[PDB]
Paper text:
Strigolactones (SLs) and karrikins (KARs) are two classes of structurally related molecules that mediate signaling pathways to stimulate seed germination. SL and KAR have been reported to be recognized by the homologous proteins [name] ([name])14–17 and [name] (HYPOSENSITIVE TO LIGHT; also known as KAI2, KARRIKIN INSENSITIVE2), respectively. To elucidate the structural basis of ligand specificity, we determined the crystal structures of ShHTL1, ShHTL4, ShHTL7, and [name] and compared their structures with those reported for ShHTL331 and ShHTL529. All the structures were highly similar to one another, consisting of a canonical α/β [name] domain and a helical cap.
Author numbering: 0, 4 to 265
The structure:
């Protein structure tokens, strides 16, 4: 159950151009805090928290509804329809890249462009498809998270940040610790098992695939896979930034690439 205030939707900035900044699992909209300065001067920047963000009242997280990314797409589309700001450029990091992809195929009218950071249509390896994870790989990760959430965060946040950026590890550790562990585990499992490869061809809006350097969850070959399989006009931008969270670890460089990717 996700309302406009429930997901902490905020519109900051000025300008007719609308930018949507959509964070991934483990953080909230504060993940974008350092990127906002680069766009509020000429964008009305739409931010919101995924239902799973620690900044959202966990009672709003319905376990029987959020069994697929589609319910997340419902929230995103409900927000853009609630805001009624019209055509917008959507920036989706990780799961929010998948959410934006699925949202654009339902409502291509809403999105002038998709900017996809840390995007993967499927983490599991498959037939000639390398997602980056074998069958047994993620089990130990979900095990550590359920067994000792704090020890898991202490390891996962520096891995997710990648580069030695203590402020990024701090911010990501914080938002991870703000999430109820059963929600983190449930969403991470749901998101990890999602497979969007079959709908990439249905995308019609153009996409910018911002591929980050050393992503524990996204191989570099994923950028080319998304280019080949996304159905719209797709440009790949291989980020110099290392790590799954370039918006946290190198916001100025990321913002530069983000600005360049805008329509």
């Amino acid at each position: 159950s996700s309302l406009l205030e429930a997901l902490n939707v905020r519109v900051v900035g000025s300008g007719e151009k609308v930018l949507v900044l959509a964070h991934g699992v483990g953080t909230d909209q504060s993940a974008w805090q350092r990127i906002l300065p680069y766009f509020v001067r000429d964008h009305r920047v739409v931010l919101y928290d995924l239902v799973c963000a620690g900044s959202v009242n966990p009672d709003y997280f319905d376990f029987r509804r959020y069994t697929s990314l589609d319910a997340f797409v419902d929230d995103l589309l409900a927000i853009l329809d609630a805001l009624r700001l019209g055509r917008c450029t959507y920036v989706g990091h990780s799961v929010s890249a998948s959410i934006g992809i699925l949202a654009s195929i339902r409502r291509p009218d809403l999105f002038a462009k998709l900017i996809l950071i840390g995007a993967s249509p499927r983490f599991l390896n498959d037939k000639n498809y390398h997602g980056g994870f074998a069958d047994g790989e993620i089990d130990t990760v979900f095990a550590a998270m359920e067994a000792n959430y704090a020890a898991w965060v202490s390891g996962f946040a520096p891995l997710a940040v990648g580069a030695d950026v203590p402020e990024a590890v701090r911010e990501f550790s914080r938002t991870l610790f703000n999430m109820r562990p059963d929600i983190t585990l449930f969403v991470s499992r749901m998101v990890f098992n999602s497979d969007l490869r079959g709908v990439l061809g249905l995308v019609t809006v153009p996409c910018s695939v911002l591929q980050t350097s050393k992503d524990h969850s996204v191989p570099e070959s994923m950028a080319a896979y998304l280019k080949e399989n996304l159905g719209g006009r797709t440009t790949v931008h291989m980020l110099d930034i290392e790590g799954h969270l370039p918006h946290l670890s190198a916001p100025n460089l990321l913002a530069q690439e983000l600005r360049r990717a805008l329509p």
